[PDB]
């Protein structure tokens, strides 16, 4: 109803702006221990914006100058997208163990994880078991048979990462277990990650 949104709506979101709209939420997963929220708007955003700019080229599909530039920017975009998904592929390809368990805690919406990832992941875990098929499956585990209880991959949430200040330059004391006394706006007092899976889901703070 209330128009004029940063999404694909009744206003111009620049290719530069569509860079902005998820650049940080890619950089976070670069520097991180566990999975972060999923996003899905991109899949229609990119393909829409990119196709429109493509056809805008496609009229003048011979040039040397600006057709070329548009192509270059497009390639930069695809680098970023492939990189995001490379990392998340990697983390769940590792973390097929108890990632499923938070998901059966709620099975979140597009927030936490995405469905095709789930198909991917359960397909894989079936593969591992039906590969172990041709190892020891006259005597496959007599108790710990399927997806197991001590077999874990990515539980750890204290990989001490760098945090970027962006808020009240005084100690705006906010959600974290530790003594985040002496918070600020352009500073950092580094800490673990478990204690803040909060501000970055608030996007109060950022990573570096």
């Amino acid at each position: 109803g209330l128009e004029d949104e940063d999404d694909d709506d009744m206003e111009q979101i620049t290719a530069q702006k569509v860079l902005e709209i998820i650049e940080t939420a890619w950089i976070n997963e670069m520097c991180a221990p566990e999975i972060l929220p999923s996003q899905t708007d991109m899949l229609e955003l990119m393909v829409s914006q990119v196709a429109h700019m493509e056809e805008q080229m496609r009229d003048l599909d011979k040039n040397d100058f600006r057709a070329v530039v548009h192509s270059m920017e497009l390639e930069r975009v695809r680098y970023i997208m492939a990189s995001y998904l490379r990392c998340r592929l990697q983390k769940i390809e590792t973390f097929t163990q108890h990632i499923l368990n938070q998901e059966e805690s709620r099975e979140p919406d597009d927030k936490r994880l995405s469905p095709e990832e789930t198909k991917f992941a359960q397909e894989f875990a079936s593969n591992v078991d039906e590969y172990f098929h041709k190892v020891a499956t006259q005597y496959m585990p007599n108790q710990q048979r399927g997806e197991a209880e001590q077999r874990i991959v990515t539980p750890n949430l204290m990989s001490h990462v760098f945090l970027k200040a962006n808020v009240a330059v005084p100690a705006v004391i906010v959600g974290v277990d530790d003594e985040e006394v002496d918070m600020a706006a352009g500073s950092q007092h580094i800490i673990p990650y478990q204690l803040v899976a909060d501000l970055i889901q608030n996007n109060q703070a950022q990573l570096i």
């Binding site: 197991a148 001590q150 077999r151 991959v153």
Partner: protein, 167 residues
């Protein structure tokens, strides 16, 4: 099933000099057959970690038990010589042994020693910041947990170089 690693099972193996308080039976992997389901209260024994990982630090089937490197004397003067206690390869990994073994002491000292030792790496690799030349530099005073970050920091500089211009 571990704090996993390619070193997944350099984990439950370190052999000891474990003594005895009471009787034993049927030593199994020792010279044992149908020969001893009985032995003495008091006998030093070399023993793995795996079966004893879960054998009752309170209970005494076995006893107060340390290795001699792991005996407290050198380790004490190396919390006073937490400055140049030198390692080599007679005890190549020396860094997270207590990361199992600490509660089996009955004297409550191990972890303090160890943490001090690696606070020294909080001070140590001040000098380690570059790859100056050819193959290898100093590659035998090393646990193979410091080996990893050592190679890693080397690489970090190695590619920083290629950044340094078009190079």
């Amino acid at each position: 099933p571990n704090y996993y690693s390619i070193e997944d099972i350099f984990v439950t193996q370190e052999k000891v000099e474990c003594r005895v308080n009471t009787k034993l039976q049927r030593m199994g992997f020792l010279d044992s057959g149908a020969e001893s389901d009985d032995l003495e209260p008091g006998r030093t024994v070399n023993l793995p970690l795996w079966y004893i990982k879960e054998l009752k630090v309170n209970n005494a089937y076995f006893t107060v038990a340390v290795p001699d490197i792991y005996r407290n004397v050198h380790k004490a003067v190396c919390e006073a010589e937490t400055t140049h206690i030198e390692l080599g390869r007679l005890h190549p990994y020396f860094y997270e042994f207590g990361r199992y073994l600490t509660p089996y002491d009955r004297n409550h000292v191990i972890g303090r020693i160890i943490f001090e030792t690696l606070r020294q790496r909080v001070r140590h690799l001040l000098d380690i910041s570059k790859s100056d030349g050819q193959a290898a530099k100093a590659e035998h005073r090393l646990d193979n947990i410091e080996a990893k970050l050592h190679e890693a920091g080397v690489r970090t500089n190695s590619q920083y170089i290629e950044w340094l211009q078009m190079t």
